[PDB]
DNA sequence: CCAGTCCGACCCGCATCCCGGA
DNA sequence: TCCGGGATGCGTGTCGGACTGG
C-alpha cells in the first residue's frame, strides 16, 4: 500500500527515514525528504487512492530537510510534481505515486559518499584550479608533478571473498572491466590485500565520451587500461602523500610485465616553472594536464564531494564567443524561474550554458521581465563568451560550459 | 568576522530498460 | 525481430547560497 516506503506518515507529511553522515569536523547530520499533497494552498490526508487517481488541482511537492547535530535546520524550495511520467502507457504513474517515486530515488542516491557501502572509500579530489598554493614547496620534501589523464576515475580493493571491487567516485560499482580486473587480481596475490589503488580508466588517443561509456556499460570492449596514481589503507589515511608513493611504486616493481595496469609516472619539482613546463609537455603528449600533489598531505576522501587542498590540477581553462538566440528556464526546485541562455553553432545546432556571477535574484528577473519583442531587440544575436573544458567531438557543442560574459557588455 | 563546508540544482554525453507501433 | 519515445541513472564537471568551525 503506502507503506511500502519506509518512513511515517503525520501531519499531513510523509518524511523518509532520515540518513545521518558525519561532517568533515567530527559532528553528526541529520538529512530529510519528505512529500506534501497542496490543493489551493492547502494540505490534504495522505490517501492510497493518490496512487491510483488524481484529485483536480492538486501537486505534490517535495522538500528537504537538512540540519546539523541540532544547529541551524534549513527548509529546500519546494519541486512541484505538476504531472506524471509515461501516462498514455501501461506504466502510468500519477501524479503522488510518482512524486512518492522520485523522492525514493533521492533516498536510495544520497546514502552514498557518506560515512557508512560495501567498505568503499570515496576517492580523494584535487581542490585548487591552475593554482599552486606557495606552501607546497616550504617542507622538507619536493611535491609531485603527474599527467592527469582524460578518463574515468576508479578505485580497485579486494573484499573479504578475494574478488576485486572496482568503484567510482560516487561509490558506484563499475561492471565487466574484466580485463583489468584480472591483472588486478594477479597482482593482488603479490601485495597486502588491504591495499586500496586509486587510479583513472582510459585508453590514449580516446575521447572522454567513449571511455565513459565502456566504464558505465554491463557489456565492455575490455581495451581500458587502469592508471594507477595512488594508494591508501583504510587505517593509515594520515600517511603522507610522499610515502604512499613510494610503497606504490614497489608495488608495481612485484610485477613489471602487465598490459592493462600501469604507474602513473612521478615528476619531482622544486618551482612552479617547473610544473608548467611538465605541464606543458603533457598537453602536446595529448594528456589533459598536470596534477601537483603536496608531499606531507593526507589522504582525504571525497565525503559530500569533499576537495583535498593538498592537490592541484593545471589544465588549459577554453574560451570562445557562440551566438545568443534564445532564453530559457530552470525546471525543479530553486532554479524553477532562473534563466539560461540558449546558445548555437555555425552548423546552427543549439545548446544551454548557466550565466555566471548572476544572482538567483537577478535571474528570477530577467526571465519573468524579459520579453521576446523586448529580447530581439537588445540581445539576440550578440555574442557570449563561453568558458568550457573542451568541445565535443561529436557536434562542437562545448562541454562544461559557463557563461562569463557578452563581448559588448550589457546588464 | 572570515574561509571553509555542504547542499541542491544544472549543462552534455552515454547506457539501459520498459514500452508499444511497424 | 527492429526502431523510436520516455524515463532513469551513470560519467567529466559546473556555480550560487546558506550555512558553520575557528
Ligand atoms: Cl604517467
Not at 558505465?216 to 604512499?244: G, I
Not at 600501469?262 to 618551482?271: A, G, L, P, R, Y
Not at 598531505?297 to 551566438?323: M, T, V, W
Amino acid at each position: 500500500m503506502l507503506n511500502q516506503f519506509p518512513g511515517q506518515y503525520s501531519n499531513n507529511i510523509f518524511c523518509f527515514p532520515p540518513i545521518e553522515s558525519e561532517t568533515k569536523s567530527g559532528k553528526k547530520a541529520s538529512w530529510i525528504i519528505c512529500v506534501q499533497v497542496v490543493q489551493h494552498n492547502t494540505i490534504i490526508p495522505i490517501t492510497d487512492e493518490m496512487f491510483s487517481t488524481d484529485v483536480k488541482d492538486a501537486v505534490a511537492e517535495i522538500f528537504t530537510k537538512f540540519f546539523v547535530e541540532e544547529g541551524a535546520v534549513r527548509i529546500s524550495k519546494m519541486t512541484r510534481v505538476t504531472e506524471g511520467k509515461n501516462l498514455g502507457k501501461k506504466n502510468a504513474t500519477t501524479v503522488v505515486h510518482q512524486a512518492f517515486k522520485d523522492a525514493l530515488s533521492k533516498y536510495n542516491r544520497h546514502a552514498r559518499q557518506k560515512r557508512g557501502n560495501r567498505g568503499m572509500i570515496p576517492p580523494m579530489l584535487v581542490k585548487y584550479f591552475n593554482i599552486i598554493p606557495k606552501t607546497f614547496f616550504e617542507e622538507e620534501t619536493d611535491p609531485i608533478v603527474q599527467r592527469k589523464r582524460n578518463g574515468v576515475r576508479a578505485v580497485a580493493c579486494q573484499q573479504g571473498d578475494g574478488c576485486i571491487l572496482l568503484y567510482s567516485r560516487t561509490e558506484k560499482e563499475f561492471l565487466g572491466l574484466d580485463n583489468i580486473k584480472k591483472e588486478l587480481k594477479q597482482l593482488y596475490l603479490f601485495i597486502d590485500v588491504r591495499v586500496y589503488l586509486d587510479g583513472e580508466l582510459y585508453l590514449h588517443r580516446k575521447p572522454l565520451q567513449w571511455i565513459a561509456g565502456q566504464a558505465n556499460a554491463k557489456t565492455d570492449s575490455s581495451e581500458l587500461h587502469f592508471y594507477v596514481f595512488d594508494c591508501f589503507w583504510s587505517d593509515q589515511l594520515q600517511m603522507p602523500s610522499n610515502k604512499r608513493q613510494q610503497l606504490l611504486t614497489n608495488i608495481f616493481k612485484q610485477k613489471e610485465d602487465l598490459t592493462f595496469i600501469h604507474q602513473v609516472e612521478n615528476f619531482s619539482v622544486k618551482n612552479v616553472d617547473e610544473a608548467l613546463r611538465l605541464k606543458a609537455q603533457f598537453i602536446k603528449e595529448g594528456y589533459e594536464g598536470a596534477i601537483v600533489r603536496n608531499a606531507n598531505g593526507p589522504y582525504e576522501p571525497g565525503y559530500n564531494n569533499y576537495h583535498s587542498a593538498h592537490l592541484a590540477k593545471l589544465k588549459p581553462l577554453l574560451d570562445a564567443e557562440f551566438i545568443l538566440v534564445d532564453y530559457t528556464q530552470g525546471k525543479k526546485g530553486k532554479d524553477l524561474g532562473a534563466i539560461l541562455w540558449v546558445c548555437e553553432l555555425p552548423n546552427k545546432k543549439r545548446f544551454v550554458v548557466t550565466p555566471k556571477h548572476l544572482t538567483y535574484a537577478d535571474r528570477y528577473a530577467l526571465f519573468q521581465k524579459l520579453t521576446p519583442a523586448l529580447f530581439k531587440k537588445h540581445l539576440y544575436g550578440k555574442e557570449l563568451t563561453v568558458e568550457y573544458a573542451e568541445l565535443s567531438p561529436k557536434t562542437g557543442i562545448p562541454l562544461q560550459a559557463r557563461a562569463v560574459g557578452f563581448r559588448e557588455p550589457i546588464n
